[model samples]
Structure formats: structure tokens, C-alpha cells
Target: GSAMGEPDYEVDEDIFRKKRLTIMDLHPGAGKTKRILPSIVREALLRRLRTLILAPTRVVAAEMEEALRGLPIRYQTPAVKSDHTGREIVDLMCHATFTTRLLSSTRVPNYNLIVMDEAHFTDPCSVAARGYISTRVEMGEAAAIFMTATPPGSTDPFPQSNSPIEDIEREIPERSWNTGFDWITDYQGKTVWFVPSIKAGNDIANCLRKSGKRVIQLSRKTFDTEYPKTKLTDWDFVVTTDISEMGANFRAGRVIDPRRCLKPVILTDGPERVILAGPIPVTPASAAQRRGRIGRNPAQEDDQYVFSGDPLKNDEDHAHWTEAKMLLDNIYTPEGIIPTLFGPEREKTQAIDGEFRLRGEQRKTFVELMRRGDLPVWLSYKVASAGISYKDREWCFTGERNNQILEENMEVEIWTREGEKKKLRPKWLDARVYADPMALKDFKEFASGRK
Candidate 1:
């Protein structure tokens, strides 16, 4: 089994000192969120808060509700999208208005509280997200906490800071606090395999398919629901990222991180037979959802495993990886989040002085961004982070590292006002670029040094 280790800062005994909302922004395979969710819910129940959990996918939302059903607290819809004809269960959708309105009102619940679970995705930049965020802000102190295992967002409003360690230390009532990655070992208690390219990834996937291994693969491609050509016993593993961070129960004895030529890796630990990567510092966002995969519960007493792509092997990758850690460390550690903190290149997209504006399909990205932060932060700082969700259209992801492809596939329109009538076209590229105004702005701001 992989040895349990710490990133630069481990979750220390002191982390349990106080209780507050927490979010972790991390890379895809970090396994931090899943390990702590149960504990967060348990604490919320103790504090007497009606937790409203919002998941990105139907699967994740369902899993969360299912996993926590055992708790003594009453269960309700995550305050997203749902309605009841006859109130058998107290309905609470992460998307509900009156619920949030009551909570956000100046008269907050004295002992009552609202818990926004998976809050990292609640970016205020998007409209649907705003619906919930608006409710939280209005709730004042009543909506006590928001928890997600991802980096803090640029749009966050709950008193921003950088010290993920310090934040975790101040909030969670747990022992040990480390922003470092968890120990990701295979289910069999051996080293995690790292296959780099989609070709290599497919090759590995094929082998697992034949052997009936419970192999899980993450891809932009439509999920593979059909069982592989091979068959595993009832206990055999299944493959998919849906199960990696959130979703159906999978009993794969081993896990693997596909290899690819991209991105910087800040930490690495290959323990002879087992492999576990460390906190790959990144902006707090949906990306960090991966860290919660390894440890079910600190007390579950199963073999803990950590996995990631092969270690950084070049100067360019190493330098960027180091820079990622330093930059993220500063962002999470409480450095003042003035626009200046963000690099110059990203400045163009900011919603500055009310003059900064994005139109049409580009506005779609904010839909995604708003979900990344809980309420207060989204409203105050990330108004521009919005996106378009084309319920009528489906898109093919360009690739893991292919921004160009993603942009090319996104639909856009150049609006021309013709005497109270507007004409629209499929300006795919421009639309995607505009889709994530806040994120693009953040990228520009964080990508370059102050001019």
C-alpha cells in the first residue's frame, strides 16, 4: 500500500480548532474532497444545519444524497432543480429561491444554518449559480458554511485568503491539515500506473477491458456505459471518472492515471511499488474535485492510494509546476486579491468600471463559473463569470489540453441590431472564448505579470 504522506502542509491536529465553510481548488486526481465530505456533513448535522448540496451532474447529486442518507438529519433535494406536488419530504433544491431568500434575509436563523456542499462550483459568474448565491448572501450569517475540496476562486466573497492550510486549520474540526495530495495507491495496495497518451490510455483501457478489471477512465468523450468486451466478477472494477470523484459505487481493486504530454506537476512520490502525487497547486475550481477519490474516510481503514500522471521530467514542466505551487500558494495563503495580484495578460477580460462587457454566447461560460463559488463571493467578485448551457446541443471536447479545439466547437453569434431585430450566427470560436468571461479574465490576470 502507498504510504500516507503530506503535501507542503499536512492537515495537522490544529486544523480541528474551529469550524467554518471550506473549499479546496485542486487538480484532477488529488482525492481531497471525497475524504472530507462525510465529515463535513456529520459536523453540519451536529451544528443543526439543513445542508443543500449542489452537484455538477445528476449522478454526483444523486450519489451525495444517497451516501449521506444514513445521517440523522433530514434529507432534501440539493436546492437545485426539483419540485414537489404533495410535500412528503421537505424539499430543498440548491436552485430554490424562497429557501435561499429566507436564509439570506437579514433576519437569519439563530441556531439554524445552511450548508452549501460542493460549493467550489457555485461561481457567482453564472445566472443559475447566482440564484443560489443571492440567497446565501441575503441569508447573512445564517448560511454558515460552504464546503468543497478545491482552490478558492477569484469570485469568492467569504473573506478571501491563501492559506488553505490556515483556512482548513481555522475551520474544520479535524486533526492534521496539509494542502498536499493524498496517498493514491491501487486498490490492490500497489503502485498506481500512469499511461500518458490517449493511445496509451486506450491500450491500458483495452487490457483492463479484457481482464474484467474495474478500470475507470476520465475523458471528454460520452461516458461508456456498455460493459467492456471482457467481464469482471460482481466485485470487478468499472471504469469512468464519474465514479472517481463522485457517482455510482465501483469496486476496482486498482486505479490508474493516464499519461499525456501536458501540464506541470508540482509534487511527486513514487514509493517503490506504489505511487502518490502531492498537492498540484491550482486555482481553486472544479479541477480539484479529483483529490477526494482515495480516502473514503480517515477511519475507514482501507488501503489509501494516490495516483497521478508520470512525474515531471523536464525543466519546462518542472519550472511551470514549481511556479504553479508558488502562485497557488500565494493565492490561497491570503495575499490580498487585488486585480494586481492577477498577472497583466488576464486583465482584458475583467469587469472593470462597468465598461467591461461581454455579449451573447460568450456569456455562457459564466453559467459554469458562477457554480464554482458559493453565494457571497459570486455576487460581489464574479459577476462576469457566466456561461451558456445548450440543452439542445451536445459538443465534443477537443482534448484535455486543447483549448483551441474546445473553442472551435463552441457555438457563438455576432449580434447585429437591425431596427429592434437582432441577427445571430454560429460564431463557434468567439462564442466559446466569451463563454467563460470571468475565467478568461482570471487566466489573463493570473497568466502574466503586472504590466
Candidate 2:
């Protein structure tokens, strides 16, 4: 409703009254999540209605829990499994990651308000089945707010760019984070280095350790188990991926109070700088997330650094640019189609509400597409095998490379409705051809006739 730097109350209030799916497109560092979201939660609490805050990542969910500490917030999994965990209260406020929420969606829960943070990663169609939208209907009069720095239908979050040669090599001779390596040596506080990938983060950590600097590594794989137990003060540095980009305030000298609220408390001075290494962030949303890690301490502003060297500008840095451009160009075309050529044993095809549904052998392929797009793949498989038998035929698919295909050297086989089994090698199914709008149209026609 309201633009950044403006009073958001009036705009947020107006949208809230509309009582439908509302999208708030705000810039990074706009305080939408911290200031705007908390205010909305407080209002819902005032009305004596329950509220559920959902985040795409666990770290973000944890950060949300920490931010709303002033309210009656109950985290999904409290660090300590005591009598205090899962307590019911009037006007209850709950925070859970989307993964946790999906697993628990089967249980009926009453909530008058639902907020989805980092909503761009969420699939709109699956929200109903995932419980954010569906549970509200069961509870009645629920309002949903989707917050994202970059909304769908907008331009690519990260535009392609080339750094000049002179700028790349002309930086300070020091090896420190902000200034040079000397700055790191002189710095006494904790630091979090943001890298493009876990491998990069680990490599940076290893290098730091070789220099006798204490370091810890964090990523999606380690956040749930490793991060919670890590005592921030014990390490000189924490090399991490985008997990720390959200509301996580990794100050230099903060430590978690393990016994009580499990909140970070200031025991000493916080970190001095958050280094942006690996591929430099190209999108405003990403840049914002990195910037947000600093300045949590009101008394001082944390320094921010982006490595502007040429080594960071390899082919991998711009790989997504070409792929993204192609996806946008073809995906919206009526002929652009992703293929479904393999599945279980007895596949069936049906028309449901103007959309085609592929069953049996096609079910698994359909399920894979759903999993890669919106639904969790494992959960979808479990549900399909649980005697439910019916899987929704949605054509949504993300172009991300499947590691399963890479690791297993997997081959897909197709079984004809007539019981003829053969290795799937349809020329039309080639991604290079099917990914093109013209060829995609012909492929869709073939698929339609075959089904």
C-alpha cells in the first residue's frame, strides 16, 4: 500500500480490509518485514485472533520469531522440548518454516491471519494445498499477506552486467575484508562472509583457518542441526550462504541464551563487517539481504564489502543470465512445453476442468514436475502412494538441473497404454528443441495425441 519511507499503516490497513491475497512489493532495507509485518501481527493479536507467520527458509523463520519477540510468539520447534513448548494461548502467534507447515497442514489449526515471508519462492497454486490459504477457509475470515522484494511478472531480479577491467584490478593492495587482509587481522569482532555457494563458503572458511583464524560454516544443510548448537563467540568468523541474509542479526559479540528464549543476546562487541564474496549479488533483493546483516546494533553501523575482483567474474557468474532470458522468452509462449514422457506402470489420461491430467506411468513424471515446481517431491510421492491414487496434473516445472539425474545416470522408460515398454528417446522430448516455442507447439500436439 504505502511506498518505502512513507507511513505504511494506512496502506497496509486498506489492503488488510480487502481481505484477500495482498502483495507488498517493497525494496530491500525498506523495513517492510521488521517494521510492517510486526505491526500487522500486533494488530491481529489485538483483535484476539491467531496469526501464523511462514518463511521459505528456516533461518528466516527463526529471524521472524526473534523479531516478533515483543509479541506472544511460539516458534514451531523450540530448542528445548519442555512443558513450555507448543503451549496454547489466546490470540496465539506461531512462526514456522514452510516445510514444517506443509508437514503439519493435515491437522486443523485456527488462524485469522497468515503472512508468507519471501513469497517469491512459493508457488501460488500450491498455497491452498499447503495450508496457508486452505486453513484460513476452515477457520473463516483469514487474511493473507505475501511479502517479497521482487514480485512476479517483474524483470529478472538480477540483471546481467560486466565489470570494467580497470575497476577489477585497481582495488586496494590490502587483503582484508573492507580495506585488506590487515583489516581482518586488526578486527576483533565476529564476522559473517556471504558466499554464492556452500562450496565457496567452505573454501573461504578453509582459507581463513589456514591463516589461524577461527571459523564456522553454515548453509541449508547445516542450519537446522549445526547452527543452533554453534556458540557464535567461539569462532572468529562464520562463512555462510544466503541463509543469514534475512532478518538474522549476526552481531559481533552476541550469544544465544540457550536456557530461556533461545534469543541472541549481546555479550560483547558484534562483528565489524559482512563480506560479499563469490559472485557479487546482482539483484536488489539479494543486495538488500546482504546489507541487512549489518547495523543491527543501534549504536554502530556494521561495514559492508563487495569483492570487485576479476576472479569472481568467471563464466559461472553469468550462467543464469542466458538461461533466465531463454526461460522468460519461451515459457510464456502457448507452444512452449515441458515434456512428460515417463511414469509408473499403468498410466491414464483424463481431462479435468479444461486441463489434461496424466495418471499411472505419467503420474511419477507429473509428480516430479510438481515437486520441482511447488510441492515437496517426497511428500507428493508419499501422498500418491497412500491409496489416494489421484495426482493433480499440473504442467509447472522449474528449469533447475536435477541433481538426481546427474548423480544416478538415470534413464527414463516409457510404457505404452498397450503394454509395450521401451526406453524413452522421443526426439521431441529433447530439452533443446522442446524449450523452443515453435518446436514446443509441435511437441505438445504430439503429446496430446499420444495421451
Candidate 3:
């Protein structure tokens, strides 16, 4: 059986192989990459072709690696060179690397095929965006595959005025908005609630808390310590803003303490839920990604809620909602963000003490400005990085277990020769502490012999 069951759209493998630019637009839960990505990787391996798969996050890259396992292919996630000891590339690699690593690499590997997962993130101005564009042309003859659940936004690099790629879109019916209060009062089990803005999430969460619901807000700033787990499956509601997109597994059933010992845990056997509080998705791709979160378990069906009217509305509510929706839509697009942060056209008016203020015309050549790192701090915060949970400067978590560690910016105090303690980063053996025994054997022996 294919990802598109009951005949939504056809997948022609020959077209995928021959086309210079191919866009696969499939719905969420349609299993687009699950069926297509592995098949192509296997075929390329059989043909003795080198391949590169670039994912938006390290978590997404890990998922793709797991899906393509058991094939006669070697995979590597290239991290900082200091961690890997300069043997950065795994031999004859079919490497899966994060976009952040691509930013610093002086020379990229030559691959016969390149697969860009979450290809929507490839706006021409970002460094990771430029890498894919240049690599495709640099290789000159490499086959490219770009896939996403939603169609491309207006600012995405593909679909230029004179486009080269063949594009295919499979239309699915839009979900009807669920009446806000009724569903919340009725629903049960583990739920992932999505909101367009942080304020909307806070307001809904406040209402749920007043009703004495077991709710936890799991946004970009959420911490492991925030939710107290009496048992593995604890929270009834998890409200979020785009953090649950890729790496979140509600029922993975594993939790680590500060001591770093693991115990068995299961979140729930019941159906999952998703709620879109406000701000309807600007793109079809985002809607699919959000909806795909629930209904994975075969044991039970899931519930999804989309709120139309505000749960707490005042006299000016209608006017505010329209303005909020417009703001969110623009923030998510490159056109809205690039001009506000980096555009020089704005300097033509609204200069304060010889400095340009907020108001500005849209820059015609703003894409180049984004490439050169000319954007403002607030814009960077919104666009580039995910929010860290703790606001304290002293401590942060690292690794999958969220093992508590000193923050990166602080200098770590370490023992040095001649009866002295020198300040430096304790990076030498951090990752190997939980690594495979076979992989750590040589390092272990070397340490033992030196002592």
C-alpha cells in the first residue's frame, strides 16, 4: 500500500528521477516521506551513487536515519569537528547532517543525489538555504528531491518567475473549525494544543487551569522540571507553539533523573488530541504538520479542535482578532520579516536622531541583506533560534535526557598540570559517557594506559 491510499495523487518514480526540480506536496498523515524517501535511497545505494539528506533539525535528521536503517548504507550526523577529532565524515557516507553544521563548512561533499527534508525552510537569504542552492549547481548533474507536507510560501527559493522544477500538489479537504468551549469541556486523554500566538496559548491555558484541568504548556521555552511526573503518563493537556512539530513524542515512555538512570514509563494508551486555539495556518504545510500529531495509535481514535471565537472576548474582540491574524501571517513570511529587520528602504523615512525607525518601504534587494547577517536581534529571535527553557544564566541541559550542565557561554573549570586549575570547556569526553561500548573501546584503553 502507498502513502496516498484510496487514490489522492499518483507518484511517478521516473519523473522524480529525471526532473531537475520536483516538489512533492502531500497531506499530513499521508506518509509521504515514509514510503518515498527509503525507496529512492535504496535505489541510489544499489546504483553506487553518493547521497546527502539535509533536515531542518537534528531531530528530523535522526528520524530519517531510523527510517532508512538496514539498507547497505553508512550514515553520519556531522557535529562540531572538535567532538569528532577531525574525522568528520564517516567513510563513503550517505550522511544526514543538520543545517547549522552546513553554515560553517568550508567545503561540502560531492554527492550524486541530495534530498532536502522540510524543504520549506530553504528561503534564499539564510545560510542553510544558500548551501542547498549552491550545492545543486556546484555538482552540476546531481538529482534533487524537495518534499514538504504543505505547499511553498511566497518567499521560498523554488518556483521562481521562470521555474525549472516540476511541481505536484494533492488537495485535501480543509478541517472544519470546532466550536471552542464545547470540545474542551468534552475531551480527554493526552492532547497537543496549537495556538498562533503566545498570548492566545496563555489565555486558553488560564481558562483550562481555572476549570482545574491537568494542563501543561509545552512551548519552545518548556522545561522538563516544569511538569511534575507522579507517574509516567501525567499531563492531560499540553499547550504549545510549534515546539511539538518534530521531536516531541508524547508516549515514548522514557524519563531521566539528574543521576542519569532511566526507568520504564508509558504516557497513555488512549487516543491523542490536537487543538488549534487561534490563528489559522498561513500555509497548508503547517496545517498538515500540526494535524499529523494525533491519531497515531491503532488502539483508539483521536480528537482535534479548532477554536473560531475567543473563549474570553470583550467589546473590541472582533477588531483585535483580525489584526492579530494579519500580524501572525506576516511574521511567518519572509516579505514581512526581511524588510522590518534588514531593509534600507525604510531609512528613506522615519529617521530618529539620524537613525531609521520602524516605518520603511519593502526593500527590492533584501534577500542579499539577509544572507549577510544584517537582521535585527528581535527578528533573529523570532526567526532563527528556538527558545531555551530556563532564563537563568548559570545552568542549561544537554543531550536527549536533558542532563543538567553548565551553560555553554560560561568557562568550565578543569584540572591542569603544575598544581593549577585552568578554565576551559569540558568537551573532551561528554558525548562518550553514554556512547556505545564498542565505539568507546579505543578511547577507554588509551585513557587507562595513560593513567
Candidate 4:
């Protein structure tokens, strides 16, 4: 229809109509994910390409699916699965024979095109990135395009030289997000006020709820997967908890602290509001849910709001942000493939982009991977992608130095499917810690060293 940027509304109305295969790496302030995604979907759908949109978390995927529901899109996500997480790989495990027998075992029906909403994380050295590629590759005939605000090794002075993943030759770096006509004036004037204590925050949230203001509340036990499929109509105030943390979007609502017992966190709700993150003993890393929701759309005349909370007492909160920032910077790194990419040194190195780049616990996860024996089924391309040699029984660690860590600290496990009986195995991994720059550089060196 209309070329990528210049949209001719009448002709380019459908999802698959636009035929160009390109990646759009927009900045955070550019509103790329929410703004550009729908356009991409519309273009693809018009062209009759059966499209699948994938997100890192169920929360983010659900939100995107909901926003595009009425537009004639088909999506399949985990819904009350009794087995494991019910990811795409899980589907392959349960229906491997059936999928193989059906349609000549090559391709699935109605899945000709694929759109990865936040797909920069799929480097082979990066667990998530590698897993994504392995999975997507199995779904043959689908033209793929990855969309993300952050790319691997983005901060390097010479990212092209230092990065680990292959530099994207297909990248459209020229159409950079312009703040003028392309800029959203509506998104410019919004701020969230932070409240340090629960009592004061509750009072304000209560007043707003009573005054017919839309509000959302995030608690420790929040129904993170829940969302309204139908357009929100009745109550001026919409109340929710935890949906914002993993990239879910909630615009223009007053949020109250439902999980203030930690005492270390205070929340800022209103205007450019999003799920605020705090650290706790149970979870390993701290991450803000749906930070993109804050500035997505412009606010009303009285959209000013307050977010009150005490600063974090421990580095846990800071660390979560730190890891999240690194993860966000390399957003496509899947949880599965990262350990492998960082092989050997996966755990020892810190993800140091800035002060709050990654958390000790999150970093600890990579370290654990390094010392572990085997990769998880999800990361090993077991469940999501096909052709993995499930019969291999080789041990992983190279020397006696890490044998103790493997025995004492290695906690990640694997479930093997042998016919109908699946067996669980305790394992340590062989992995290393690597960012985009290092992963890219290492890959180059390895290739050249081979020469």
C-alpha cells in the first residue's frame, strides 16, 4: 500500500499488505513498540501472511494480543497449562509426532509471517536470542522481522568492532526517530510522583478511587496474567496488580502499593504511570513491569499524579534495574540461550552498563549457568525447536575446579522426555557471561582463529 513511513490509510489498511522485510530499531522515547507494531501487523495481515507476535513475557504478549484482537489476528499463548510453562517448545514436545505427520512435517498452516515484538535478545551467546532463532527457524516459510528499542552492545564506542553478535547488515539505522513531526508532543508533558510510604500512598489512591479516578494496584500476589479482553467501559477506575511489571501497558491510572510490606519500596502512580519495581527475598531479580506504558499516550488536562516511596535500602532493587537495563539493552537475549552464549564465564562477569545495570542475584544466575552441567530443554532447543539430539549424555564441566560448584551450588534442572515417561535431572551448566560487544567480538575472533 503506502511505503513504510508514508501511510496511505485507505490502501494499507490490512496487516500483511506491506511486503518489505526490515527491522526497526527505534529509541525508547520514539514510541516504537506500541506505535509501530500495530502498523507492522496491519501491513502483514493485509498480505495474508499468517503472523505470530512473540514477547518475552506472557504479560507483554497478552497486552499486545488484546490491543489487536478486534483487528482479525490469531494468536496462541499459554492458558492454564497443567504441564510446564506451555511455551512453543512445549507444544512441539506434546505434538511432535502429530506435527511431523501433518502437512508433510515441514511447515504449519496459517503461519507464513512472524513478528518478534522485542526480539533483540536472540544471540547464540545470549540464551534468549539463540532460543528465539532456534524456535523461529523451525516454523519454516515465515519471513521474520525483529523489533526492539535496544540492541546488543549499543553503548560501545565502536559497537561494530566490539559486539559479539553479527552486526545486522539489514538494519535501517538511517530512518532514526526524529523528534519533530515524528515526535509525539502528547508524550512529552507527563511525570509520576513517588510516595515513600504505604499509608500516604493508600490515602491518595483511596481518594482517587472514591473520586471516580481510574486506578490500578499491584500486589505481591497480583494476578499478573489477567487483562480485560473487552474494551474497558464501566468503572472510571480500573484496578489491577503486577500486569505492568513485565511490559504490560496501563495508561492514565492512579496506582497504590498492594505490596508495601517489604518497606523498602514506595510507588509513584499517576500521569505517565507504570508498574514500579522493588526487591524482595523470594525473587532473584528486580524489574519494572510495563515501563513503556508511562509515556505511550499523551495525558488529559488534569493527568498530574503522585508516586511516593522510600528509596531502596538494599542493592537488590538497584541490581534488578541493572540487570533489567542490560537485558533491555540486549532485549532479545532469551532466558534459554544466554547461558550458552556466555559459556564458561557466564556467571563471573558483571553486566556493567551503569550503576543500576544488573542485580547480584541476576548476575548470580549467569554464574550458576557457567558452573552447571547441562542446558535446560527450553534453551537446548528441545521443546520449542526441533532436531536437538536428545540422546546425548556427555558431561559438561572441563576441570575439578568447578566440580564443587556443580555439586554444591548448581541448581538449574532438566526434564527429559523418553517416550511417555519424562525424567527430571539435576544439572550444572557450561556457560559464560557475554554482552553483545563481547559476544560479537568473541564470535569474530573464533571465526578468524579457525582460519
Best-performing candidate as measured by lDDT: 2
For candidate 1, write residues 1-451 as lDDT tens digits. 8976533333323222233233343222234444455565566555444444444444444555665666543333334323333221222333223233222233322223444444444222112232333233343433334444542333221122122211111121011223332322123432223333233445555655554455444432223333221123443333332223322223222333331222222232321111112223222222223323333333333422233333332222222222222222211101122111112112222223222223444333332222222212222112333243422111212212322322346532222222221112211222212233443333222112111
Error of 3 at 138 (Å): 9.5
- On lDDT, who's better, 1 or 2? 2
List residue ranges in candidate 3 displaced over 4 A: 1-19, 25-35, 72-78, 81-99, 122-131, 134-139, 153-182, 197-203, 206-212, 221-233, 245-285, 292-305, 309-451
Candidate 1, superposed: residue stretches over 4 Å from native: 1-51, 67-114, 120-135, 138-144, 149-200, 210-243, 246-253, 258-292, 295-426, 430-451
- The TM-score values for the models, in the order shown, are 0.39, 0.47, 0.45, 0.35
- lDDT tens digits, residue span 1-451, model 4: 6546434334223223233233544333223334556666676655655555555454555566665665654444222122222222111111111111221222333344545555433212223332223334433334555454433222221121111221111111111123442111232332221222233334544655554444444322233422332134433333333223333334433222222222121122421111223322211111111222333333222332222222232332322222232332322222222212222123322554333222334433332222231222212221112221223322221213322222124432332222222211212221221112332233222212221
Candidate 2 least-lDDT 10 residues: 256-265
Q: Candidates sorted by TM-score, descending order?
A: 2, 3, 1, 4
**Which structure is stronger by lDDT: 2 or 3?**
2
Candidate 3 Cα lDDT to native = 0.36
Best by TM-score: 2
Assess candidate 3 and give its TM-score to the true structure.
0.45
Which one wins by TM-score: 1 or 4? 1
Clashing pairs counted in every model: 103, 11, 2, 78
